[PDB]
Amino acid sequence: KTVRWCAVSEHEATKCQSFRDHMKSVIPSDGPSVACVKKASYLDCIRAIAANEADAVTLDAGLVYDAYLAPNNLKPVVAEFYGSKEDPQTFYYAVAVVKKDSGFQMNQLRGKKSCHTGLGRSAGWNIPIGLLYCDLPEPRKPLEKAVANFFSGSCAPCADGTDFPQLCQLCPGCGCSTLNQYFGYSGAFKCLKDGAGDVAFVKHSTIFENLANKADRDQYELLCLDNTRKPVDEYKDCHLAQVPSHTVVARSMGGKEDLIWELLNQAQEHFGKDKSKEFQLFSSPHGKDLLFKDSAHGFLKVPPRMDAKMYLGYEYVTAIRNLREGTCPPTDECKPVKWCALSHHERLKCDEWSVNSVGKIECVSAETTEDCIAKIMNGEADAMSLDGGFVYIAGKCGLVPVLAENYDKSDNCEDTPEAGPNHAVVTRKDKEACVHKILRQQQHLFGSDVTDCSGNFCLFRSETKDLLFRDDTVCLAKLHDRNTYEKYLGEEYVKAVGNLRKCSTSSLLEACTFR
Amino acid sequence: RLYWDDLKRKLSEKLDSTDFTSTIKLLNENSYVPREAGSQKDENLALYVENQFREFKLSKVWRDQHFVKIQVKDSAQNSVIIVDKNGRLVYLVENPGGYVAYSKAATVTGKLVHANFGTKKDFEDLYTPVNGSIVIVRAGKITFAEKVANAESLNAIGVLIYMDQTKFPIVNAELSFFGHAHLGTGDPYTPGFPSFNHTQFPPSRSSGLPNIPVQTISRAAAEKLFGNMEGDCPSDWKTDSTCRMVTSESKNVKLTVSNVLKEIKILNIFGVIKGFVEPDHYVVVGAQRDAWGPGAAKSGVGTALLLKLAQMFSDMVLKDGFQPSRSIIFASWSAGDFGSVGATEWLEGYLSSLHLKAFTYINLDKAVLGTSNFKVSASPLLYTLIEKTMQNVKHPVTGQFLYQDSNWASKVEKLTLDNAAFPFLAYSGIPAVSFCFCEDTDYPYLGTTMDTYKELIERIPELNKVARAAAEVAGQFVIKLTHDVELNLDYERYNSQLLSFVRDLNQYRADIKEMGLSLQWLYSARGDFFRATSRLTTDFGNAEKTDRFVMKKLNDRVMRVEYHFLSPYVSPKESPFRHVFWGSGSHTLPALLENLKLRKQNNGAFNETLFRNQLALATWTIQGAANALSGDVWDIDN
Amino acid sequence: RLYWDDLKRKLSEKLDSTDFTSTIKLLNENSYVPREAGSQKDENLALYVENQFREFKLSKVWRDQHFVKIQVKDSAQNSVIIVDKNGRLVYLVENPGGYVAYSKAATVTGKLVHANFGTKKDFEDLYTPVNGSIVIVRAGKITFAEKVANAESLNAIGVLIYMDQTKFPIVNAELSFFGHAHLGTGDPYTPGFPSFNHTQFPPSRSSGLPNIPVQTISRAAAEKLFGNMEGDCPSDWKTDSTCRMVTSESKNVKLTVSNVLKEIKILNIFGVIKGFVEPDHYVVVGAQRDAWGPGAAKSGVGTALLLKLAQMFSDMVLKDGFQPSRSIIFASWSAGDFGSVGATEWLEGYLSSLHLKAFTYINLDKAVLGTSNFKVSASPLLYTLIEKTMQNVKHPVTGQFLYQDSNWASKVEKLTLDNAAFPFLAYSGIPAVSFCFCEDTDYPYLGTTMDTYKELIERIPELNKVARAAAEVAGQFVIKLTHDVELNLDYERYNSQLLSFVRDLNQYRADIKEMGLSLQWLYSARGDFFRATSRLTTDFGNAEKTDRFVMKKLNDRVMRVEYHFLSPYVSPKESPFRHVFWGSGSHTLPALLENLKLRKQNNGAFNETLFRNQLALATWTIQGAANALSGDVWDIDN
């Protein structure tokens, strides 16, 4: 069936109809087809897919956050890769480009003029501003007014010109369209080369997309975190931060994830890169970065389970939400550790424990053992007990274990670890310190206790059989070693579960092993 | 256009140019010197405020007139004398100038026992039985009504209230004070329903009305009574060395009270500024206008803060361009001295019109009493809003911010019956707040005629600055509550409240088990509530703040939070304070525990049948409040 | 995309292809022959419907399980015998096969008086005093509970219920019937609160529970009793020529009932189809599943209509593309035979979750009993929706439309206690509807085991067509209620209701005047209400139907209309049916008049103090319902 598509501005609308005419020549072998919808900005495209007007449009990782929020609810289906088709990359580098012999450094950006790709875009706004927000002079909110005072002049695509006059000093009206000379990667670079701004926050491939001469490229320098400057060609050694690649988004329900990928995998072969002389999906004579990014070299399937907040990951989602609220972080006071329960019996045991812990432990509920793991990732949960197999699944996501369920009774149980593999308490990177501390405090209050539970609470005993922990557990040993999923499962067991996961694959494992 | 910080600054500037003292003194002029509710001078200040509101060019200005029944001292002055065993004897002790409204009005005679403050705990420690005898107490331990209520429970004959010199550093020992003993909010003869000619005022009597006489007497009068009494009072209670425990078997006191009830015309003056995004939703700001004596501290300051806040906000809108998302109502209540009467009539009266339209109440009464510390009692749903304001406003004397105690949330005390905010939260289910630039020790002349402007300005040199700091705190509560799409109500605050409840009830898990009862359901009830708010929190995090529709569905749910804690089962008329956490009676969470404490002593004071029900209704009530908060009915499995 | 007419047609087509009889017979199979609430066969059909709902691929399917207490006939069968003055004598009259749930269960003996139907009016006309004597009545005059209630008020000892041959044309005169005497909705041992293990089932007893034994007996059994009785019954009552007024002084009857209460596991099966514009708002459709006997007419038909309607609407969405603005919930209740128990537990249980989320209820119980006329009892707010449907649907037998009586609105009768809809409207404040393809005379074997499929299909040849016409009427109520932005609730209908009230009360203006009372306030109360709806009507007329925001603010106000008629003052637990117009007790408008009627006879039955309050609360309640409806709080001056 016909897969509608959203286009921004006239230049992209002309590339859309060309995306239509060219395709219908070799189409349709089975069914796929493309359509064209007119929209003023990307914000209009996200709102359109939610109203069923469109079906899919490519968004920047930083603009994905706005697409999955209510009521838009849009989940990415196909993500484009950068580099080559041989060795695909699911993450591009965000970097700050400046002129040579400028004098300005990363720490000294105040007063200087800026060129941003687009308000809310990874390389253009989220990463560059992300590090300056906590250094910005109050008030921090609105974040836009803070930036309008930090930089003297600036061009922020998609920004409110009426509410913020300084944010559109370089590009009046702050257009979000290709109609605006200063828009996107190549648009922010033409804002630097034109001497309008002293700095342009873009991608590492932006320098090569605009300039071809290595002699012309030496006229520019690259800013680095440690307040230094290195050759542009050294993007890997000197950059700001790594961010997820641009992906096409569609509705979570009724978005036709398969009918869109069937089109894109067939479109990259007919009108892709190094395949046709008539039409190119990543190149157009009417404009740059139309529909897709010129720096892209194809597409890749976004797993089923993987949602918007899982595609960006904890590290990045939290950073965006903190950037919009103006939150700037250790006091080592800790926060209640959110335990994840699975069954009805687990939550009941958890609830009775939450009250007994004086609020130190809280309870979050999940449907499946795999679903609790997902919540620990995005932040909805903090820790849960997992068996050897699942620890491998969780580890491949980004959760490192900190406790092990010992079963052998000894004088010093917590002090000495046990190999086995045994049940491990996986947690998130940041909440590893407190989980290590809080659960150790309960051990002295609800651990090895006389059989008087009838009156008091007992942490290891379950009303039925193995609820939050295994009943035959004596104590929770602390892993003094910075143990990961690889450092805890030895070496032979690691390869064991890996190959077994080859045939029997879960929806989570294929998600955590995607990027 | 205008963000928070731009509003904070525009407010501060307006405050700097505003002169409060001048207004507080103008309200203490000879034309407003006596404010007794329903007086010609009470109405005088009523018209003033009305015309003042109209002058501020507010979007709408209206007035409600109720015909409630108060009580007064007639031509037959009351008197307290000591008599002999056969009949009248000894000497005349005092001719009270002040009285206690809603007293039984009768003549009683009997032994006189000192119950100290009159707390239910004070009576239990008394070595002398209070049954069949007149008791004398010291005010401020608990409301006047509670002292009488606790005494009547232990079968007292009458009650005498005085002001010792320790708690009250007043030179003039002949000074008398006023108060009411109604254990109720608003008029006591239209319990649970509005006082309007509409109802024809059918015969109805509040259960909060005492069946025992209550009279106030000066310090000197009490000392005269102690001279006829023996038994040194315990050092436990910081009191005068005059204090005497009981009377001699030869002579006992004879109290005679003959107060007569009077029907008056009370006036409630309002002023409303319409919001632009949501006109129907509104926060309410009120202040007592009536006063037994001059009332500079009791009502003078508050009514002044109301006039100015209505002024400052009208200016910010008309001139500055401040755009309010939700309406703001300013109310000047009357009959306050008789128990938030004016306000409570309005609540009982337009309950249907404010069901879920009114999201918060800010009370200005007694906001300035001292200068030492900053006190605030309110609904948890405002704790965060308060905390954020404490660390935003600077103390009027010390340059430091109001946020100095991190664990201040845990030190907050429940709202009492005498507070005008009580009715709003416990009855209407509208989050209420009541802050104070209080002093470690309560204001001396609070009920005395002594509460003049001279006395206030003298005990508080920098009155104007403190009044401004006050107006500022309330001013930000308004800016925060109506400013932006998000409602600054923190439904999450309650988790601590429920955790506290369950933890205290878990202590008695031994008795629970002994009875055919399990405490597992309450553990879940609390958990389900926490997960409910968490999901709500995330639902806010995963939403587009700019989408009018998705926020309404989220802010609407948040507003109920308070409502859902009002126990549905009890009749609002007989038990108006339905809120489980802050209301009154058996239904309230405290009552459930209070009753279970009696089970530990194995005595017959504990009612098992009652407890089983107290428990069953409470657990569901917590449980149902949780099921609702989530978002939908079909989705919640458990 | 799809408009009304396109939906009407798509519904009719689905109906034509749907076979109802086949389903009604499948529910009468040997595996579902006995449905007694809580039985293994009751749960059998419960699972079936659940799996059937899940099969219809509905958006969500859940179940609630309550542990309520019903009553059953144990090993000790009850018995009715006639005895002598000194002791046992005469002969055994009958060994009842059927009983009356919630009977006092005890042995009583005394004279036997025929109270006919048992109406409060029937007792007043009796020439023979009912005090201290057993009374025998004929069912269908008023609910079984009311017959017992009215008799106990006049101090009866016990009650006997039978089915005369006139009102009941049943050949087999030995046939016995079942019923309950609880003057309450839902379980009687968890009055006013949900029955869930959560509550631990604290000791609680419904006030609707009788303190007198009640037993059912066959026609033959009663005729045997009439043989020992003298006194020809009045022709006034169309009854058998066997009927006898009273027993001879030589021999009187001795009733012995020993029913024992039993705890059972009741199951409520649900299914919800989410709307697209407003998921949270929803209309509820339900049908009783349990049945004492086979219950083809009592529950067979209804449960069948529920399954098919859930089917037809799932198809219209999944396939046809029907887009519902608001969700639709389908409920299969149990324990219905004991007084809407299953349903009422759900209402008491998720009241907070459905406060203003559930806007209407459609009941399918007893929708097909005859074929002569079409009967419907519901809230005025649905009168218009009904009228429009009556003239849209065609009678299953005669080709003419259902709209034949123009003044049908004035012939509509209140919803009764036995109707599953009653709890929804009178307790929850959710407009409810209950239509019927009724017959001038009620179904004979309604409670009898006689209510089989054979008997139903035989008394109603074209059962399938009548079932379809039924499903169609309910089907359009759903299409109308969830279809478009406007809510088909006609708040204006009530003006007639209030006008009627005031007009009847104006008749007694003489007595009103004699007492210190004026009736002017109620005149205004009604007027203010009318102007309130009129303004609402115009506010709808002056709005852009396509604007989501301006309609929510207008539809939200409309939904409350019903809620605001639920008297706030009375405790929901003791007096659950709070609605003034359709509830029970003194608070209800009828009660106010009922009591004033006693004032005309100048006897001591009239309570003045009560009336003054009945009046004061009622007038405000009408008055406050009007103030709210307008739109805002500040604007209304009067």
Ligand SMILES: *[C@@H]1O[C@H](CO)[C@@H](O)[C@H](O)[C@H]1NC(C)=O
């Ligand atoms: C209201 O009733 C009072 C007597 O209680 C009377 O003095 C007053 O005039 C009445 N006012 C109205 C409007 O009925």
Ligand SMILES: *[C@@H]1O[C@H](CO)[C@@H](O)[C@H](O)[C@H]1NC(C)=O
């Ligand atoms: C609920 O209580 C009943 C006894 O009334 C018991 O048989 C049943 O097992 C209990 N179920 C649960 C979940 O507590």
Ligand SMILES: [Ca+2]
């Ligand atoms: Ca009142």
Ligand SMILES: [Ca+2]
């Ligand atoms: Ca119940």
Ligand SMILES: [Fe+3]
């Ligand atoms: Fe990017």
